[PDB]
Each structure stands twice: as C-alpha cells, then as structure tokens.
C-alpha cells in the first residue's frame, strides 16, 4: 500500500532527465539518440530478430504442451467477462495508434520502395511483410508477459507486479532485492517511453488531419502542445474519474468506430480488389513467415540494417515497451481463462482483425497507385491516411471520424497504462492513488512533447530512436520471463505429487547403476 | 416413403430449363455461360481461393481437437467395413474422370505454358501445381461435407439429408420450411451439374480413345450421343438393379484396373525419372503450398484471372459440386469410424494415390517433352493419354484397357450419385425409388449431352463455365456446413454435462463482478 | 556367450576382400568404386532422398502419437543418467569428425560455388543448406534405429541385436534364421565402413594439421599410416582396458572451448547476425532442399548430390547400427517422446551453433577479402581459419587433440557395439572380438586412403555410399518393425482385443443384412 519510493524515484529521475535534456538541449539530445540507436541496432539487433520469433514458437508450444488445460485462477473457476466482451477490451488496450498511423503508410511504402531482398511494385510482399509486423510476432509478446503475470497473480497468488513473476528464477529474497526493484523500474521506464512514442505519433497525425479537414490551416509548434494537452487531459481523467463509464464502454466504442471506418473504405473503395488481397496476403504471409523472420542486418548483402532499424527493430522494440502494461491489463481481465484460451484469444483474434484492417486500407492505397491516383503526396507518413480518405467520396465526414478514432484508440490504452503504472508504484495494489496515476499520465505527455519538439523537422526519427533504446533493457526481461514462466508452470500443485515420484525413482536408478558397476 | 415433390420439381425445372435452352439456343447459351463465368470469377473468385484453404485448415484442427476421438455413431461401435475395403470405396466413389483426363494434360500443360508468377519449362512447379489441385484442397471438401452428414445421421440420429446438417443453425423448423428446401435443391442441382461435367469430359476422352485405337475414324456428334447413351445405361443399371455387386466389386475392380495401368506406365516408361520426381513433387508441393493457396486474380500483375478460371476455380467448383453426393456416400460407408480416423482416411490416403498417379503420368509426359518426343500432338486434352500410351511398347492393347478403366471410373461414382439423389427426394430414405434414381441418372446425361453439343469446338470451355456457375450457390452451403458442424460437435452428449457447469459458474462469476462494480461504483 | 561364427565370417570376408583388393590392385579398386557409385546414385539416389525425409516425418509423428508416452523399460521406471550426462554422451558418441572436417569447408564451399538451383555468393543458402545436412535429417536416423533397439531390448525383453528388433515382421523363426543373420552382417559391414570413412577423413585433417603446425614438415602417405596406427590404439585401448562418460564430457568441454575461441575473437556480431538468418532460411527452404533430386537444376544436381547429400545420408546411415545400440544402452527408462526430442533437437542445436561460429567466420572472411580457401583442400580449411585469428597457434593444436577425442569416443563405442552383434547381443563382449573389429576398421581406413592417391576424399566417399546402400533398406524396414511392436504393447492389447471383436460383429451383421436384403 506504500508508494515504493525505491521504484518511483529512479523512474522519475530518468524521465525528468529526458525532459530537461530533450527540451533544454535539442541538438545534444538528437545526436545521442542517433548514436544510441546505431550501437543498439548493430550490436543487439540480432537479439530482437532472434528472440522475436522465439516468442512465437514458445507461446504456440505452451498452448499445446500439457499446460493449455491449466486455468488462470482456481480449478473450476469461470471467466467473469463474456468472450465477446473479453476480446473487445484486449484489442482496445492492446492497440493504440498503429492501425491509423501505419494502416496506409506501411503497406504503401513497401509497394513503392520495396523491402530488402526483394523488388519494388510487388503487392505480395508489400502486404505479407505488413502482416509480419502486426499479426503474430507482436501479439506473442503480450501473451508471454500477460500469461506470466496472470499465472503468478491468480494461480500462485502473488502481488500484481513484474518482479513477482520472477520469483521462481530469483526466489523471494530477490523480488524485494536489487533485482526486483530493477525489473519493476524497467517496466515503468519502458511503459512511459512506450506510450509517449504512440502519443507523439498520434499527435502528429491528429494535427495533420486538422490541416486536411481545415478545422485549422496548418499545424504549428503550439498546436502540438494543444493536441497533447487535450489528449493527456482526456485519458488522465478517464483513468482516475469515477464519473462516466469504465474501460469496458470505451473499449466497445473503439470497435464500433473502427468498424465504421473500415466498412466505409471497404464499401466505397475498391471492394473486389480489397477482397482479392485477403487470401493473397495471408498465403504470402504464411509462405514467407520464416524467410521474413530470418531477415537481419546481414540480409540483402548487409544493406538491410538501415531498413530494419526503422521498420522491424522499431516495431519489436515498440511492442515490447507496451508489453509491461498490456500484460498486466490482460492479466486483470482473464481471471479464469485456461492457458490455451488466453494464448489463442490474444494471438489469433487480434491478429485476424489486423489482417483485415491492413488489407482494407493497405489494399486501397496500393490499388490507387496501380490505377494512377497516388495518395503519397509529399511523402509525410502522417498525411497519408487522410489523403486516402479524402480521395474516396464522402471522406470529408470520415476524415473527422478518423480523428475521434485516433483520439479514442490512444485513450483506451493510455488510461490503462496510467492505472497500471500506478499499481507498480505501490506494492502491486489494484487501487492506485489518483495522484500517482495522474502523475504518470503527465510523464508520458512530457516525454511525448519532448520527443516531438526536440525532433523538429524530422520528429518521427527522434520518436523512434528513443523507443528502441528505452525498450532494449526490457527486451531481456521478456526473455527471462520465458524461463521464469516455465518454472512456474512445471512446479504446479497438480504436478508436485507426480514430480516427487520421478525424483525418487531417478535417485534410486542412479544409485543402482553406480553400485552395480562396481560389483 | 413419400416423394419430396417440393424438391423434385424446383430442381427438375432448372435441369429442364437448361436442356431446352442448350439444344435449341446453342448460340445464346454459350454467350450467357461465358458472361456468367466472368461475373462469378470477377466477384466471387476470392471466395473459392479464400475458402478453399479454410477447408483444409478447418478439417485439420477438427481432427486434432478434442472432437477427433468422437465416434461416428454410438460409443463402443465398431466399423462394419474392412479398413482396406473402406478406402477402396472411398476413392472409387470420390474420384471419377478426373485422374484419367488430367493425368497427362495438366502436368504437361504447366511444363510448357507455365503458371502465373513462374517461368516455363519448370518441372518442380509443373508437378507441385497438379498436386495442389488434386491432393488436399479437393479432398478436404469431401471430409467437411461427409463429416457433417455422418455426424448428424449417426451420432445424432437425424435424417440423411443436407438440410438436417444445418439444424444446429436454422433449427428443426428452419430445416423444413424454406431454407432447408433451398439447401436440398442446391445440392441436387450441384450434383446434377457436377456429375454432368464428368460425363461430358469422360465422353470426350472415350471418343478420343476410339480414334486413337482406330475403332472409330472420326468422333462426330452422333457418336458422343452413342457413348453417353451407353454410359448412362451403365450406371442406371448398376444403381437400381440388385444384381452385379454394385459396390465393393466395381469399386475394387477400379483399384485393380487403375493400378494395372499405373504400373504399366511405371515399368515400361522412364522408371528412374518417375522415381526422381516422386520426392521432388512432394517437396515442392509442401514448399509452395501457401504460395499457390494465395494465388488470386491479382497474381502475375493481374494476368492470373484467366488462368484461374480454367484450372483453379474450375477445380474448386468441380469438387464443390461433387461433395453433396460424395459426402453423403462417405457417411454411409464410415459408420462407427471415429472423426480423426475418418478425416485422416479421406484427406491422406486418397491424396497419396493421386500423388503417385500424377508422377507416373505427369512425369512420363514431362520426360518425353524434355527428350524431344512430345505427346502434345495438336494440343487437345482428350487425346494426350492415348498419345502417351501409344508411345510405349504394348500401348495398343494397353490403350483399350484405359478406355474400360475410364468407363468404370465413372460408373462407380455416377451410380452412387443417382442413388444419393433419389435419397434426397425421399426425405432421406436410404433405399429410394428405382424410377426416381433412374430419372435422376437420365437428367445427368441430358445436361452432360447439352454441354457438349452446345459448345461445339469449345466443348471443354462450355462444360467448365456451367460447372462454376452451378457450383457457386453450393459454395456457401459448404461454408455454412463448417459453421453448423462445430456447433453440432460442441453440443454433444459427452460434452453437454461439462458445458452446463462452466456456463453456470460463468454466470455466477459475471454476476459477482457486476455487483462488486456496483458496490464500488456508489462510493 | 558364443561368438556366432556364422556372422563374423561373412563380415570378415567382405572386410578382408576389400583390404586385399584396395591394397593389391589400386586401379581396379578405384575403377570399381566409381562404377558402383554411379550405379547406386542413379538407380537409388531417390531412395536416399525420398526416404531421408520420411525418417524426419516418421519420428515426429511417433513422438506426437500416443506412443510418445510409452517408457522404455518397466512401467514407472526412471532414467539411470542425469539429463545433462545423458545428452553429453549421445552427442559425443553420435558425432565423429564431421563437425571438425566440415565445420568450415561446407558452408564456405556453397558460398563460393553455390548449390543446385541457386546463385553463388549467397550466405542465406550457404548456411541454410549446411544445417540441412547436420541438424534433423541426420539425427532422425539415429532416433529411428536407437528407438527400435531400445524398445525391443527393454520393453519387450528381446536380445540386444539389430535382428531382434525385426521379429515383428520376420518372426521369431526368421530372426534366428537367415534373414536375421544378414541383417546382422549388414549391420557390421555398414559400421566398419562408416567408421573407417570417418577414420580416413580424421587422419587427413590431423595429417594436414601437423603440416600446418610445423610439427611434421610435410604430409606423407607414410606419415598418415603413423596417425591411423596411433589413433587405432587409443580407441582400442578405451574399449578394452579399465571411461566413456569421462571422455564424452572432455569432448564437450574441449569442443566448446574451441567454439568459444572463434566466437570471441572472430566477428562476434556477424556470427550472431547469422544465428537467426540461418534458422529462418533453414525452415524456409526445408522442403525445397528436402526435394532436391537429380532432376533438379536440369541434371546438374546429380554430380553435386553424390558428393554432398547422398554421401551424408549414406554416411549417417552407416553409423546408425552402432549409434543405435549405444543410444539404447544409455536411454533406459526414458519415455519415447523424451527420447526423440533429446536426440533430434539438442544435437541439432549444437550443430546449428557450431556451423554458425565456424561457417560464419569463414564466410565473412570471404566477404572481407581475406580468403582462407588457399589451395582448396577440404582438410586445410579449418587450420587456415584458426591461423587467421589471433592466438590460433595454440588453438590450432587443440583442434588436432579435438579431432582425436571426437573420433575416439565414437570409435570406442563402435567396437564395443561391434563386439556385441557377434556375441549374440551380450553386453560384455569378449575383449579380443572388440580388438579384432577395431583393427579391421583401421585396415579399411588405410585401404581407402592409400588407394585414393591424390583424391583420397572421393575414394572414401564412393565406398561408404556402396557399403551403406544395403543398410538403407534395413532402416526403411525398421519403420515398419517399430510400428508393428509399438502397437502390440501390453497397454494396448486389451483395447485392441475388444475393438477387433466389436468390428467383427459389425461386419458379420452387415453380411447377414446383405443376405437378408439381396435375397
Ligand atoms: C536446426 C533447427 C531444427 C529445429 C527447428 C525448431 C524446432 C523447435 C521445437 C521446439 C520443441 C519444444 C519442446 C516442447 C514440445 C512441446 C510439446 C510437448 O512437449 O507436449 C507434451 C506436454 O508438455 C511438456 O511436458 C513439455 C513442454 C515443454 C515445456 C514448455 C517449455 C517451453 C517450450 C517452448 C517451445 C520452444 C520454443 C523455442 C523455439 C522453438 C505432451 O503433450 P500432450 O501429452 O498434451 O499431447 C500428446 C498426447 O498425449 C498424445 O496425442
Ligand atoms: C490470425 C489469422 C490472421 C493471419 C495471421 C496468422 C496466420 C494464419 C494462421 C492460421 C491459424 C488458423 C488456425 C487457428 C485456429 C485454432 C483453433 C483451435 O486451436 O481449436 C479450436 C478449433 O476448432 C474449430 O472450431 C475450427 C477452427 C477452424 C480454423 C480454420 C482456420 C482457417 C484459416 C485459413 C485462412 C484462409 C487463408 C486463405 C489462403 C491464403 C477449438 O475450438 P472450438 O470452437 O471447436 O471449441 C473448443 C471447445 O469446444 C471449447 O468450447
Ligand atoms: C516429405 C515426405 C514425407 C512423406 C510421408 C511422411 C509421413 C510418414 C510418417 C508419418 C507416419 C508414421 C506413423 C507412426 C505411427 C503413429 C500412429 C498413431 O499412433 O497415430 C497418431 C499419429 O499418427 C498420425 O497422425 C499420422 C499422420 C500422418 C502424417 C502424414 C504426413 C505426410 C503428408 C504431408 C502432407 C502432404 C500430403 C501429400 C502430398 C499431397 C495420431 O493418432 P492417435 O494415435 O492419437 O489416435 C488414433 C486415431 O484413431 C486417429 O487414427
Ligand atoms: Na487503445
Ligand atoms: Na469413380
């Protein structure tokens, strides 16, 4: 119930230093972020690439290897959220602004420029390589972190923290030791920079749309603060205000506005061409899955390092930053699901929705390029979605609807992050003081502004460089959550009696052999 | 039993509407079919491609899930057919003219012309594409349709109708009024138009068999009528008459005769080159399985649209239209057989026989092409097999036995279609009227003839256009069968007791949560 | 206790005839080997390739199947060796000089020359095709043979022979009769020529290692005779006097030191960029490489396959008879599923990391420009690589000591096993019977090395393919024999007995119903 000042103070100091450094000295901060990315991507990029696909293997195995039957709670327990409602709150908190910002930019960018090891103007690899970054590899990080927290919190009954998930690996003395503190600090620093990156990427696109919709003429440096201040003041209140409906209501407004914007483009846009990419993109994704997972800085004659540092290694570092707080939320909602249900509900359902979104939006953008109409414009990634919407008839009203979607796809996740950061500040208490939950909401905004204003002309690169550095320390925490998780699952109360017999029989068999050899 | 006159008449009107429209207005029928094919392929082409692979995935998780152990019948039941004789009737009924007609022409056509997104003269792609069209995607449609009927008929004791398999979705009342009747005429129309495509294709190859054997000099239009007339008598006599050991003897004769012609080509032909292709075709098939499963009209920079309508979408429509009556037959001969045992038996064993078949005949044809001696000839698909056989020693005598095998590969499947069609008009009576079984056999021959005389030179094109159109309505019945199947399986007696406790506990937990939220909500 | 002279004599005649033939008439022996090699590769090339992949499929399906839980021994038994000590002795005994000889020659050869159907200078396929030959296809033959012997010996109580694992097919009378003596003769000839092929290659690399290290001025045919004789006594001494566990652990520690040396002082980061780039490519092309016959590349693959793929498959099949009975001996009380995974995966993991450190470090040198190819002799690639790295003059000698233990641990277990197939499956075989087979292996090793002249590699390869062809069909027949007696387990007869009775009634009812209705 205390404030665990051994976790708040180290996390505040790093956050405050970034705000002072980024805002105070823009030139120095930008150079360090560029230098830090090169060292991280060069000497550590293999870790993201190698372990990014180990998570997918590890999770699928855990969902079939004798543990899919265990239940995240007590035996005979039942889920407190109906399946349809349960799925809605996980994709709303799981996804922020990644289907809006990159829904059109990414599949279109790979169509024009191409991907390393391939040619340009290829719709098979433009779409398949987009599904690679948004279907299984990213959502397998949430399952691993969410499952480790869900099991320890419910089956074993420990505090709601990320250190407690490591009790098997570092014992109970280490959960209160220097390691327990460090694992918890890295979960807040990752979350603050993980959300601040998506706040900065959503403030750019909301401001970009206003120029399109002409509510405003063009974004300015003060406009970004205005958008961030409104977005910050929205999720900060929605998290810590009893008035209004909870996250289960907002999580349902997301899936309604998102389906409104997807159905509009699907119907108005090239329906038949969109429907043809759905099998072609899934078929190309499954045949190229391992070929794409084996792409490193050594691929394409060693020239793919620059591409990976902006597309793959950024996404993997981005999703890992959101895992510490999207794992804790996913744990809260399950409370009764079996390991198989949790794994297959997180891996397959969010992956199916992301497949349809990118074919409706990525397919429309690519189809426009083939036809002759090009929504690329000046190339800015923020302006591409609204250039597509405005091309379609009736897009003026939908351009406005896309803003509410942009704002409401970050509020659902940002508010959950604050309430999840608040519980780490205390000793895993579900109820968090509204002041610490509001204090962390401001921290993401202060970082979100710092990464945007400091970036200047190129604010995307600065927002992406800092995320990769802030997520590298927590990449290893996720790797060590695979070993901690298996130790917990093996030492289950429904396996202790069976494991004791094997320990006894194994000891005797060794004793018989050593004595038998002498005789 | 009482004839289902509410299904015979609406289905018979479609059949007779096409016959008069085809013989009398050949000029206007071909135009409509070609225009209909364009409308279907352009708009619903993705459906065949997208859901042709969901069937493979759906019937693999079903076999691998907890439903695999279920037994198609009571618990403690045991199959009534020797597992060897179960396969023989499974393959004999499930396959007809296909292997004989496209055994040589498909692998050779892809070797010369190539496939979209690939170069010509590529043996790996040529062989790994004909295995795609004939191994797992086609036989996964039979398993889904056959399993839905087998489960409802035996495990749940409903009537043997395609409507009854939808009771989980539309209910016992929906399955009777108007949706059930629609699903029961779309199944008869698909069966009539799916078996008429095989009859037309078989008559074309039989006519070429007599030209190559020189028994007939020139196949005119009055000999095709002679061939179809003999064939339609063959499977009407077998279907209705109680003598002759209709099945388990003519189905066992098909393996004996099918293997005799495969062994002849294997040993007389390039045996070592055939065996070198066998591991290369399977390896290439599994490597490119998902590249071919995602080949839509957007492939080859938009050039694949015309290719798919001739090979991929035609096959998926050809197999979709045969699944109403193959699935119904596979249910009867698979009583007491578990779900996993049923799915693996259908998916794997028939897929293995096809793989060996196309290596011996596709490999021999491709090997000849490389050497310099080409059996392509003029390029008619109906004359390739006999061009291959006559290029080997002893082919003259062995070309006559290919025609007999060609006929017997239709009779074993056409007689089971007429019998199943009669059952669909007897409210599911296993033994239907002889004059309803025979009437439906004559209907199949009438349409098969109408699509040959109407086409003229492009007889094959007219047969493929109509099959795709007739099998489009049933594409959605198969999509719906895989939604009513999981509900049927889920609501099983063995799982019913456990489900009730889980629902009961879930309601309490949900109610407990909402109350706690209210208690915290107030203050 | 008897020596089964009716199996020893036929084995000796084939072994002795080869020694006289090769030494007596080198020209005739070399000409016959080339003629026989072409005859087998053309006619039976598909058999090695077609059934090479069926072994991988067959073993995974058996571990997946219900049989996976059957325990090799009595119900509720426990293993005699710790999992780490059991793993260490399976790899040391199952791997001879293959990793040392081809650690740098194979991945580097494919980078320069390419592979059938692919362009040259491709690091992706150089490493992906290198792991094809050393990860799953090879180690799956060991599990098929090791499992058939382990199951029949322990869970059925039959004598520890290769013929005793065939009684489900040939019957008890057949195994005692003639077919089961030819299976024992072929099981001896294959292991004599397989172990002599690796002894020949080991002597070439040690002979080249001495010349490179300046210990011996030049490599002379009379110098190699000294190496083989010295190597002959080491493994004969270990299998006779009063061991395996100690030397198998000295293998792993000493080998891991050599791998750590190259890893640390080589391009560490570039090595790690290939760890996921080779696993991704391996899984991508697994079925493209698994379906590579002589028909691939339009007849150009026939000459390549006989040198790389069909050679390895015949080389690993040669070692299966005696690695099968060694794997069975130490795997008492392990479940079938635990046996398959402990053999297929862990040795594949060590091989995958071995070639990345050594194949990667040799390919980067090619890319940089400093090529270690030199003259191009396969036996000099390793010592070119080590000398390039700093400190490779002391680590270039430990490679030769590591070439001794690698062969000695496997050769020590070959003689012990070869002396058991002659004494009616008696574990404690006569000391002189092991010695007799120990020097018969050395005589064959020299015969192929001397008769080969300048091209000693081709003579060793052409004769192991012919010697391992008869035993290709014994492994193909072990899949059927293994399935026959796995089904007929004590924990399935009651279930199988009831099912057959019910099925017979169902057939009887149908036949009676048919008569009633047919009338
Ligand atoms: C050169 C590269 C070649 C290799 C390519 C990569 C291969 C990766 C393979 C990874 C194997 C993982 C080993 C664990 C297998 C999982 C399945 C399993 O063990 O299931 C058993 C139960 O599970 C266990 O007891 C052990 C499971 C492992 C514990 C979890 C550890 C994490 C493993 C994650 C996978 C590895 C991820 C790393 C990357 C592959 C038995 O299952 P069952 O009894 O429920 O079903 C069979 C039924 O009875 C008969 O039909
Ligand atoms: C996420 C998809 C987007 C693409 C990205 C991922 C790449 C594709 C991966 C393909 C995964 C498909 C298979 C995953 C489904 C797992 C199903 C499973 O594990 O078990 C269930 C499966 O059982 C089924 O119901 C059938 C599932 C059908 C799955 C078919 C998958 C089709 C996907 C193919 C796409 C087509 C692509 C076109 C060609 C490119 C059991 O549930 P149940 O509803 O039967 O009830 C169980 C129990 O009673 C509880 O009450
Ligand atoms: C690349 C070339 C590969 C070619 C062939 C490889 C496959 C052959 C090896 C696998 C078969 C060995 C069978 C070993 C005995 C296990 C039998 C067994 O116990 O059944 C279990 C394991 O058996 C299997 O699942 C068999 C799987 C066969 C795998 C076939 C793979 C080859 C096909 C690949 C796809 C390509 C298709 C052909 C090309 C068109 C599963 O069922 P269950 O025992 O749990 O319950 C029984 C129930 O009644 C069901 O019968
Ligand atoms: Na959200
Ligand atoms: Na047939």
């Amino acid at each position: 119930a205390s404030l665990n000042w051994s976790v708040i103070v180290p996390a505040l100091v790093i956050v405050l230093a970034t705000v002072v450094w980024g805002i105070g000295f823009k030139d120095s901060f930008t150079n360090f972020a560029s230098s830090a990315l090169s060292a991280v991507v060069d000497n550590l990029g293999w870790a993201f690439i190698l372990f990014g696909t180990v998570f997918v293997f590890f999770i699928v195995v855990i969902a079939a290897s004798k543990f899919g039957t265990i239940r995240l709670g007590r035996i005979d327990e039942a889920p407190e959220f109906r399946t349809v409602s349960w799925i809605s709150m996980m994709f709303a908190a799981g996804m922020g602004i990644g289907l809006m910002f990159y829904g059109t930019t990414e599949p279109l960018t790979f169509y024009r420029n191409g991907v390393p090891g391939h040619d340009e103007h290829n719709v098979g690899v433009a779409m398949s390589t987009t599904m690679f970054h948004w279907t299984l590899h990213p959502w397998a990080i949430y399952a691993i972190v969410g499952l480790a927290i869900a099991y320890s919190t419910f089956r074993v009954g420990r505090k709601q923290l990320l250190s407690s998930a490591f009790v098997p690996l570092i014992g109970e003395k280490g959960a209160e030791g220097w390691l327990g503190k460090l694992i918890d600090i890295l979960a807040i620093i990752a979350t603050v920079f993980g959300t601040a990156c998506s706040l900065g990427l959503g403030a750019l696109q909301i401001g970009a749309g206003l120029s399109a919709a002409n509510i405003i003429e063009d974004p300015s440096d003060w406009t970004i603060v205005g958008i961030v201040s409104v977005l910050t003041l929205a999720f900060i209140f929605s998290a810590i205000s009893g008035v209004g409906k909870g996250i289960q209501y907002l999580s349902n407004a997301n899936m309604v506005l998102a389906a409104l914007l997807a159905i509009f483009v699907f119907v108005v846009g090239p329906t038949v061409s969109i429907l043809n990419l759905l099998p072609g993109s899934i078929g190309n994704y499954l045949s190229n899955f391992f070929q794409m997972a084996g792409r490193t800085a050594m691929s394409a004659d060693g020239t793919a390092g620059e591409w990976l540092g902006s597309w793959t290694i950024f996404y993997w570092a981005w999703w890992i930053s959101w895992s510490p707080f999207v794992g804790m939320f996913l744990a809260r909602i399950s409370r009764g699901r079996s390991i198989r249900e949790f794994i297959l509900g997180v891996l397959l359902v969010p992956a199916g929705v992301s497949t349809v979104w990118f074919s409706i939006f990525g397919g429309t953008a690519i189809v426009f390029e083939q036809n002759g109409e090009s929504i690329w414009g000046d190339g800015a990634a923020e302006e591409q979605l609204f250039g597509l919407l405005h091309a379609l008839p009736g897009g003026q009203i939908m351009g406005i609807i896309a803003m509410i979607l942009l704002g409401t796809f970050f509020i659902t996740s940002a508010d959950s992050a604050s309430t999840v950061m608040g519980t780490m500040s205390q000793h895993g208490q579900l109820e968090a003081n509204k002041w610490v939950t509001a204090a962390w909401g401001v921290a993401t905004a202060a970082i979100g502004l710092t990464l945007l204003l400091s970036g200047g002309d190129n604010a995307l690169s600065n927002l992406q460089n800092v995320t990769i550095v802030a997520a590298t320390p927590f990449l290893f925490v996720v790797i060590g959550l695979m070993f901690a998780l298996v130790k917990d699952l093996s030492n289950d109360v429904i396996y202790l009696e069976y494991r004791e017999q094997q320990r006894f029989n194994a000891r005797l068999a060794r004793e018989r052999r050593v004595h038998n050899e002498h005789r």
Side-chain angles (χ1 to χ4, degrees), chain A:
Chain A
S2 187
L3 274 289
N4 215 53
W5 295 111
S6 291
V7 157
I8 307 193
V9 161
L12 272 173
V13 160
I14 279 159
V15 169
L16 291 183
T18 295
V19 168
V20 173
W21 190 14
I23 293 284
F25 317 87
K26 301 191 167 188
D27 299 346
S28 295
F29 188 68
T30 288
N31 282 249
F32 160 81
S34 283
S35 293
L37 175 66
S38 300
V40 159
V41 162
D42 292 11
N43 325 127
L44 223 69
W46 62 273
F48 285 107
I49 307 285
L50 171 59
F51 291 107
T53 175
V54 170
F55 300 155
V56 187
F57 280 164
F58 174 90
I59 274 286
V60 167
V61 158
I62 291 268
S65 80
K66 175 181 76 163
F67 299 136
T69 38
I70 290 161
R71 300 195 81 76
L72 300 172
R74 91 196 79 266
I75 312 132
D76 289 345
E77 188 165 357
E80 57 201 29
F81 290 87
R82 57 193 305 94
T83 299
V84 172
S85 193
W86 166 55
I87 272 157
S88 281
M89 317 162 63
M90 59 145 87
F91 197 93
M95 181 69 58
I97 59 117
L99 302 183
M100 314 291 308
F101 202 94
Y102 293 106
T104 295
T105 303
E106 179 167 7
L108 175 49
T109 291
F110 300 148
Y111 182 77
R112 305 169 93 267
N113 312 348
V115 310
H118 295 270
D119 55 319
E120 316 181 6
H121 294 244
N122 193 352
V123 70
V125 315
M127 289 303 314
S128 82
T129 202
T130 317
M131 311 198 33
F132 175 74
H133 291 137
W134 294 97
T135 48
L136 289 186
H137 288 240
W139 288 97
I141 294 149
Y142 291 171
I144 292 171
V145 180
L147 170 54
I149 298 148
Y151 182 92
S152 93
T153 303
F154 306 145
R155 197 81 173 172
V156 190
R158 323 202 183 114
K159 300 177 188 295
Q160 254 277 34
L161 289 139
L162 217 51
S163 67
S164 289
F166 281 87
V167 161
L169 214 68
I170 76 196
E172 267 280 16
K173 285 187 177 180
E176 318 291 54
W178 74 275
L179 246 190
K181 268 55 168 313
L182 184 61
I183 286 165
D184 281 321
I185 286 147
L186 297 178
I188 297 162
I189 284 159
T191 283
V192 163
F193 285 85
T195 55
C197 170
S198 85
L199 179 45
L201 294 176
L204 287 167
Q205 200 174 9
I206 276 164
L210 289 166
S211 77
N214 314 130
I215 287 72
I216 303 180
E217 288 293 348
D218 85 312
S220 61
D221 204 88
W222 265 124
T223 312
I224 292 284
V225 165
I227 299 146
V228 168
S229 56
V230 164
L231 284 184
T232 279
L233 202 31
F235 79 74
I236 199 169
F237 285 170
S238 175
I240 65 88
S241 201
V243 61
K245 304 125 194 182
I247 192 67
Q248 186 170 324
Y249 161 77
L250 253 291
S251 302
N252 264 261
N254 247 330
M255 313 276 97
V256 168
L257 276 151
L260 249 70
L261 193 67
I263 291 163
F264 168 86
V265 180
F266 179 64
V267 171
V268 170
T271 309
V272 170
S273 303
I274 282 159
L275 287 163
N276 283 350
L277 299 163
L278 188 55
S281 85
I282 299 163
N284 274 282
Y285 168 57
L286 280 168
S287 90
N288 298 6
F289 181 85
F290 295 119
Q291 183 221 270
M292 287 186 294
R295 182 157 49 205
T296 57
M298 273 216 101
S299 176
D301 296 69
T303 63
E306 215 280 354
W307 187 88
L308 284 167
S310 319
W311 290 108
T312 290
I313 282 157
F314 163 57
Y315 290 162
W316 283 187
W318 198 11
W319 286 84
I320 277 160
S321 307
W322 273 46
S323 81
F325 89 79
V326 175
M328 288 207 30
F329 181 76
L330 259 46
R332 270 139 196 245
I333 299 333
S334 279
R335 179 60 178 163
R337 306 288 181 169
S338 53
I339 306 278
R340 240 200 290 282
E341 237 171 46
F342 175 84
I343 296 276
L344 297 178
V346 178
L347 212 80
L348 297 180
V349 162
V353 171
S354 304
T355 286
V356 169
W357 180 278
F358 277 89
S359 79
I360 288 163
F361 281 79
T364 312
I366 284 168
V367 159
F368 281 14
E369 274 279 301
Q370 291 174 335
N371 283 350
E373 326 155 89
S374 64
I375 62 172
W376 192 254
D378 51 19
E382 55 240 43
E383 284 126 46
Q384 282 197 57
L385 164 61
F386 300 107
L388 163 57
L389 283 174
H390 280 50
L392 315 175
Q396 331 308 330
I397 292 88
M398 296 297 103
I400 276 65
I401 291 280
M403 292 212 181
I404 288 88
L405 208 34
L406 255 170
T408 200
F409 242 151
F410 172 84
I411 288 155
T412 56
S413 312
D415 72 26
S416 314
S418 302
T419 70
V420 163
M421 290 195 252
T423 173
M424 299 172 216
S425 271
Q426 284 130 48
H427 293 100
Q429 188 197 25
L430 177 63
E431 287 309 309
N433 309 339
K434 301 151 286 201
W435 291 95
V436 64
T437 297
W440 288 123
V442 167
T444 73
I447 293 285
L449 297 174
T450 290
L451 301 171
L452 274 182
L453 310 180
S454 296
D457 49 81
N458 50 5
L460 228 61
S461 273
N462 205 41
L463 271 163
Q464 295 172 10
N465 301 3
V466 180
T467 302
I468 292 158
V469 189
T472 280
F474 192 82
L475 160 63
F476 313 132
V477 177
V478 188
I479 296 165
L481 260 177
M482 296 204 285
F483 293 96
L485 172 54
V486 173
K487 270 196 169 137
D488 246 314
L489 285 168
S490 295
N491 316 356
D492 203 33
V493 153
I494 62 156
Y495 299 144
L496 294 174
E497 53 85 34
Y498 174 76
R499 282 162 82 71
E500 177 265 314
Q501 280 151 224
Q502 308 322 98
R503 189 65 46 69
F504 190 71
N505 295 340
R507 171 79 62 70
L508 295 175
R510 299 212 264 289
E511 287 292 349
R512 290 186 195 91
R513 188 180 46 78
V514 65
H515 173 258
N516 178 21
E517 156 272 337
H518 289 107
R519 98 182 68 161

